[PDB]
Amino acid sequence: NLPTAQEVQGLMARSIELVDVGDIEAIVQMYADDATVENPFGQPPIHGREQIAAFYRQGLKVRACLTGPVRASHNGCGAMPFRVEMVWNGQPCALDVIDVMRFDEHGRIQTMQAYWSEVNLSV
Amino acid sequence: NLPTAQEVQGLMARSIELVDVGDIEAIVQMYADDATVENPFGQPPIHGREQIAAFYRQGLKVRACLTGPVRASHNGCGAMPFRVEMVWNGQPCALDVIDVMRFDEHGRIQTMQAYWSEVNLSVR
Numbered sequence: 075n076l077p078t079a080q081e082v083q084g085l086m087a088r089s090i091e092l093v094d095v096g097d098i099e100a101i102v103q104m105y106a107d108d109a110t111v112e113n114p115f116g117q118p119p120i121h122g123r124e125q126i127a128a129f130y131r132q133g134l135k136v137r138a139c140l141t142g143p144v145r146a147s148h149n150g151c152g153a154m155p156f157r158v159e160m161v162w163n164g165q166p167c168a169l170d171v172i173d174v175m176r177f178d179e180h181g182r183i184q185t186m187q188a189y190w191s192e193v194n195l196s197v
Numbered sequence: 198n199l200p201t202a203q204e205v206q207g208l209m210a211r212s213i214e215l216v217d218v219g220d221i222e223a224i225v226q227m228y229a230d231d232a233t234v235e236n237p238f239g240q241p242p243i244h245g246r247e248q249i250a251a252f253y254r255q256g257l258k259v260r261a262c263l264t265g266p267v268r269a270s271h272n273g274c275g276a277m278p279f280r281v282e283m284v285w286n287g288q289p290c291a292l293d294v295i296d297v298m299r300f301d302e303h304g305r306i307q308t309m310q311a312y313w314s315e316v317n318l319s320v321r
């Protein structure tokens with residue numbers, strides 16, 4: 075069914091865990107089959123598990139950790155802050171992001187928007 | 198004009214400053230005259246500076262701090278995480294919230310959605 079707020083906090087937290095270990099198969103299975111991802115928010119969205127797989131394939135040594143609790147609503151949505159560590163121009167950099175997700179009635183991510191820009195990038 | 202990413206970070210951070218001191222007039226001014234706020238996200242929205250003034254008068258001893266940096270996009274939007282401290286019938290508590298805001302070409306908040314629920318509430 076439409077995930078409760080507690081359920082949303084556990085799913086959002088698990089998607090960051092899966093990113094962190096680079097488990098592309100498990101990541102893409104968290105998404106609805108026709109989910110849309112906008113990352114960064116403002117850019118054209120990508121649609122469908124195929125494209126979202128390709129995204130993570132290309133994007134993912136990269137680490138990612140929640141930097142605070144997940145915030146969850148009563149209508150299936152929530153938002154979380156996290157930090158991605160990865161290489162930029164040959165040095166270790168960090169990028170601060172917040173992801174906003176809405177879930178469908180099967181508990182899968184229907185949409186994700188990832189808020190970040192170069193102002194959030196640090197060497 | 199449409200606020201740049203760095204501008205967004207400044208405006209969103211100023212909004213938490215003005216909540217934290219409780220300056221109702223000043224908070225309300227940061228919003229468009231016909232702004233919509235959904236707080237909490239999922240409830241019916243409140244429209245217009247006047248209903249948003251009433252929200253803050255009713256809601257604001259209350260403190261609020263950013264608990265990490267503002268994430269800003271290039272299309273006048275940003276999100277930020279912060280914590281609100283308050284007292285709910287004698288019980289000190291804290292609530293973690295993330296606000297997502299979309300600014301208009303005058304640098305005022307056109308929409309705000311506040312993400313949280315009771316799962317985000319904590320005693321003391």
Ligand SMILES: C[C@]12CCc3c(ccc4cc(O)ccc34)[C@@H]1CCC2=O
Nearest residue numbers: 093113133136158160169171173188
């Ligand atoms: C793609 C990326 C690594 C992973 C990642 C980025 C940005 C936003 C994300 C949001 C997510 O929910 C998960 C992963 C990322 C980085 C931007 C530059 C890059 O190295």
Ligand SMILES: C[C@]12CCc3c(ccc4cc(O)ccc34)[C@@H]1CCC2=O
Nearest residue numbers: 216236256257259281283294296311
């Ligand atoms: C309204 C409130 C104090 C301020 C506040 C709440 C929730 C979300 C907020 C979002 C903001 O952008 C600014 C203030 C609040 C609390 C709910 C219980 C309480 O009294």
